[PDB]
């Protein structure tokens, strides 16, 4: 699939706001993911033991990982579709080291869209949400094809 330049502008316009508080957004997103789909928390051997949302908020480690994850996703969205290099090392680790099924990438996509809707309603109307959703669908599609080349799932 190919986004238009007007669709990438809606995605990078709301991302510019996210980047004013990277740690905050990375933390909200992971917590939302772990609350909504608790099974995903099991894939993190470093966080697995956190029992409540209050424990998750207080975790400095979780907050450091939210920064790492969001910064890597930002770098991919700023490429505007030309992200092949950035996707290779990410596909290799998530398929072979971490073993993250595509279904979980769909769950985190849902958590990203929930948090931006919540924190940025004026910049995340229907058209902006449709463009972000396309950008994450493009990312999931490319990653799924790389997973299949690497021998995982498909
Ligand atoms: C937009 C999607 C995602 C991005 C951009 C992202 C990026 C990252 C990055 C940059 C790292 C550190 C380097 C590496 O190991 O590759 C990482 C680590 C990891 N990721 Fe992801 N990731 C994504 C989705 C997920 C999903 C949905 C899960 C689990 C449900 C997941 C589980 C992990 C785990 C288990 C690690 C290791 C954490 C630790 O022990 O250090 N990732 N991820």
UniProtKB/Swiss-Prot annotation:
Q: Does the keyword Manganese apply?
A: no
Q: List the InterPro entries.
A: Globin, Globin-like_sf, Myoglobin
Phosphoserine PTM sites in chain numbering: 4
What Pfam families does the record point to?
Globin
Q: What is its main location?
A: cytoplasm
Q: Where is the Globin domain?
A: 2-148
**Origin superkingdom:** Eukaryota
For the ligand (nitrite), the binding residues are 65
For this UniProt entry, the molecular function terms from Gene Ontology, in alphabetical order, are:
heme binding; metal ion binding; nitrite reductase activity; oxygen binding; oxygen carrier activity; peroxidase activity
Residues where O2 binds: 65
Describe the reaction catalysed, as an equation. Answer: Fe(III)-heme b-[protein] + nitric oxide + H2O = Fe(II)-heme b-[protein] + nitrite + 2 H(+); H2O2 + AH2 = A + 2 H2O
Q: Which parts of the sequence bind heme b? A: 94
Record's subcellular location: Cytoplasm, Sarcoplasm
Q: Which UniProt keywords apply?
A: Cytoplasm, Heme, Iron, Metal-binding, Muscle protein, Oxidoreductase, Oxygen transport, Phosphoprotein, Transport
E.C. number: 1.7.-.-, 1.11.1.-
According to the UniProt record, list the residues that bear Phosphothreonine. Answer: 68
**Family in the record:** Belongs to the globin family.
- Relate the assembly described in the record: Monomeric.
- Job description of the protein: Monomeric heme protein which primary function is to store oxygen and facilitate its diffusion within muscle tissues. Reversibly binds oxygen through a pentacoordinated heme iron and enables its timely and efficient release as needed during periods of heightened demand. Depending on the oxidative conditions of tissues and cells, and in addition to its ability to bind oxygen, it also has a nitrite reductase activity whereby it regulates the production of bioactive nitric oxide.
* Descriptive protein name: Myoglobin
């Amino acid at each position: 699939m190919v986004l238009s330049e007007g669709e990438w502008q809606l995605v990078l316009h709301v991302w510019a706001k996210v980047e004013a508080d990277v740690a905050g957004h990375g933390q909200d997103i992971l917590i939302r993911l772990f609350k909504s789909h608790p099974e995903t928390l099991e894939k993190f051997d470093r966080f697995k033991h956190l029992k409540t949302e209050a424990e998750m908020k207080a975790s400095e480690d979780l907050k450091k990982h939210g920064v790492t994850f969001l910064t890597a996703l930002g770098a991919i969205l700023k490429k505007k579709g030309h992200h092949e290099a950035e996707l290779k090392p990410l596909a290799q680790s998530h398929a072979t080291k971490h073993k993250i099924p595509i279904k979980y990438l769909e769950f985190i996509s849902e958590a990203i869209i929930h948090v931006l809707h919540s924190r940025h309603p004026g910049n995340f109307g229907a058209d902006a949400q449709g463009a972000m959703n396309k950008a994450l669908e493009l990312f999931r599609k490319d990653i799924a094809a790389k997973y299949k080349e690497l021998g995982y799932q498909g």
